Design a binder for these strands. Structure first.
Lengths: 96, 192, 113
DNA sequence: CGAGGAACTCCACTTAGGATGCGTCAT
DNA sequence: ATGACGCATCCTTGAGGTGTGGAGTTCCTCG
């Protein structure tokens, strides 16, 4: 899942920045890493709201936590009102 | 470790852009997305208490600057008279005097231009120091360096998401709530 | 110039290393932008994460940077290519990790009857 | 504070996977 | 042999893609 990848990358940036600041590197690189962490979290919570959305293998954008809820294909208008049911057949109609 | 800001509330829909502090979204995206510093803290009471001493020290150091520039000016004068004398003694060509005077005048105007520039940035230090107010943005950085070295150990100013946390750690609500209510019934149009 | 700047950076001066890394920063991003943008794998925007990481490598090379007059640009290109290769061996080795959303929810059966 | 007016945010939404840096630590 | 380690090769630069339509609104720059 894409959220897996987003969490993976933000954790990567967190680890990199924490290890960099563990020793006290010069402030320019530290600030750049901090802003990259901010941007990574921004993309995580809503990939498409700010900036170019982060993609994955293809050119298609990934999906954030605020895209799996809203929209027609989210949760509300896709999974709670109508839930596909058992004991539910279908076939062709003929007049008798 | 590096603090971060939620995206829905800050930078999100304009209707709920924060507004706990009266700032534009542009201001928020300079302060948080790393363009310019802000002033997170101010000690105006101690500043006013010491204003006798602060102005006394400013006068002392500006007099020191002025006498340093006067020493530089007399150094310029001795250089100018020395080159005048030696090139008049030489007399190699009819254009050495005019060219050396052109160069000397270029040097003179450069010297006075940078003296004017340093007194002018000291005037910017003046106005920024008397208007030392929180929720203000400083685009340049070297001027901020000068300000914090000269006015050391008085206030706090920086970047950082937690820098806003400290702001929210200090900002009250009721007093300005009353103030904006007063401007709500004593005011004009879109101010309300 | 940059040579003297890196010299006094390795000397131990904080501002010298500050300016050195500031100058290295954008060039590192731009080189990784031109190199990693076409590599197989979802790395087109991870070029930042290994760009300033080269500066991290610079940080672990500066204290013992016994310079022989060589420019730092060949160095930076070297670590950039090496970290690109590190990504290559991290991804292309057992590259089963595919971020497919369109064939994961319908294609996965449920064990619970 | 009163103008144009142009961004920003909502809503209508249907297959197999392009490598290295080279050397080697360790299993 | 892989996925790990420990560095660390003197001339330097993307890539394409981006063809509605609807009104809401709110800031933001100019009277």
């Amino acid at each position: 899942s894409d959220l897996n990848d987003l969490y993976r990358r933000v954790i990567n940036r967190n680890n990199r920045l924490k290890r960099l600041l563990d020793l006290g590197a010069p402030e320019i690189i530290v600030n750049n890493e901090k802003r990259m962490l901010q941007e990574a979290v921004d993309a995580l919570f809503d990939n498409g709201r700010r900036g170019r959305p982060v993609t994955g293998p293809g050119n298609r954008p990934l999906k954030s936590l605020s895209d799996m809820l809203k929209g027609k294909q989210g949760r509300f208008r896709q999974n709670l009102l109508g839930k596909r049911v058992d004991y539910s057949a279908r076939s062709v109609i003929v007049v008798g | 470790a590096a603090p971060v800001t939620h995206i829905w509330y800050f930078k999100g829909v304009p209707s709920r852009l924060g507004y706990l502090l009266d700032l534009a979204p542009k201001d928020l995206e300079k302060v948080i997305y790393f363009a310019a510093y802000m002033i997170t803290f101010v000690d105006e009471e101690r500043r006013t208490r010491d204003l006798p001493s602060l102005e006394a020290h400013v006068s002392v150091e500006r007099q020191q600057i002025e006498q340093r520039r006067d020493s530089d000016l007399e150094a310029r004068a001795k250089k100018l008279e020395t080159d005048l004398a030696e090139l008049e003694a030489e007399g190699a060509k009819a254009d050495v005097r005019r060219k050396v005077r052109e160069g000397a005048e270029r040097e003179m105007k450069q010297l006075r231009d940078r003296a004017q520039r340093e007194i002018d940035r000291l005037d910017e230090v003046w106005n920024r120091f008397k208007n030392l107010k929180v929720q203000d943005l400083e685009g340049d950085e070297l001027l901020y360096r000068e300000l914090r070295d000269r006015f050391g150990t008085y206030f706090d100013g920086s970047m950082g998401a937690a820098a806003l946390q400290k702001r929210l750690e200090s900002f009250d609500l009721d007093e300005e709530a009353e103030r904006l209510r007063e401007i709500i019934r004593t005011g004009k149009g879109q101010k309300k | 110039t940059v040579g003297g700047l890196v010299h006094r950076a390795v000397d131990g001066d904080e501002q010298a290393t500050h300016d050195l890394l500031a100058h290295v920063h954008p060039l590192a991003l731009r080189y990784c932008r031109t190199r990693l943008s076409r590599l197989p794998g979802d790395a087109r925007h991870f070029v930042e994460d290994l760009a300033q990481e080269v500066c991290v490598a610079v940080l672990l090379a500066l204290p013992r940077y016994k310079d022989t007059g060589r420019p730092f640009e060949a160095f930076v290109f070297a670590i950039a290519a090496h970290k690109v290769a590190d990504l290559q061996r991290a991804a292309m080795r057992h590259p089963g990790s595919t971020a497919v959303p369109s064939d994961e929810m319908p294609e996965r059966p449920d064990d619970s009857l």
